Design a protein around this ligand. Sequence first.
Ligand SMILES: O=C1CN(S(=O)(=O)/C=C/c2ccc(Cl)cc2)CCN1CC1CCN(c2ccncc2)CC1
Ligand SMILES: [Ca+2]
Lengths: 235, 51
Amino acid sequence: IVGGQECKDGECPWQALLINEENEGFCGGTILSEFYILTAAHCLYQAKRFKVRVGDRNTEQEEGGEAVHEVEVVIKHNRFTKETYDFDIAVLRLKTPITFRMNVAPACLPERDWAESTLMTQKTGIVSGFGRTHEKGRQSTRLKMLEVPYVDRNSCKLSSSFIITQNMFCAGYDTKQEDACQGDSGGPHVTRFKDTYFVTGIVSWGEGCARKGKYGIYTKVTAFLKWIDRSMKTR
Amino acid sequence: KLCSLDNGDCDQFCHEEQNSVVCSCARGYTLADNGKACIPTGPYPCGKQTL
Ligand SMILES: O=C1CN(S(=O)(=O)/C=C/c2ccc(Cl)cc2)CCN1CC1CCN(c2ccncc2)CC1
Ligand SMILES: [Ca+2]
């Protein structure tokens, strides 16, 4: 994350971190339920074999209940395109259930319409991860959370340098040094509505990190609901 | 009627599934008896920051 707040106790309980063999964070995820994690399809191409950690806010001082889990099956999206980051979205079925405790709970899945209408028209949205604090920097031990405002789609497509397919939507700022970054991809993007957060995005990509004239590109979860729904029925 | 006025006065999902407003909740929540409020059924519902 680039310039944001810290996730205090119990605020980002739906965060998940995909760890590599050397036990380093390298992508984010979102707890959809006790057996399912939602991440970005392209994250699966950054590690030979990984695991998914949960309930962790400090990657140095062993806190209360951080649990590690092993992947039973990986369900990438048929249409995931490498070169255009299109259809960036996956799902992981864990071998052992997840026990919900402080710092470890699931974010809600909304219904497309209502979501894209109410949820997606709110002002800001929350994104979090253990990714780099800023472009050319080092990852980050603490888990952060930024309140990124939704971006106009037309003003979004114009700022880009690459096609913004239907499975995407910008979010962030024009110049204010605040945005997602390396190591956040796959991370959760949630929208708050009456003290209840909803999955509304997946840290997909961006051009640099918090650059002027650029925004953070997130995967449009509402366009994949029915797909995510099927996936959580194993297939 | 009108999920536009103020989400139909629903705690969550709002639809005009007829001639009026119809509320519904996410999985793991039961629509209260006032057709609008969402009541958690389990000990750790989705959407809620752990406290
Ligand atoms: O310039 C970059 C930066 N990184 S990054 O720092 O780790 C993450 C960025 C990011 C920021 C905010 C948010 Cl919401 C999400 C992700 C990724 C790789 N590149 C290089 C580029 C290379 C080409 N790209 C295309 C995208 C679509 N179509 C074609 C090409 C995107 C990334
Ligand atoms: Ca820890």
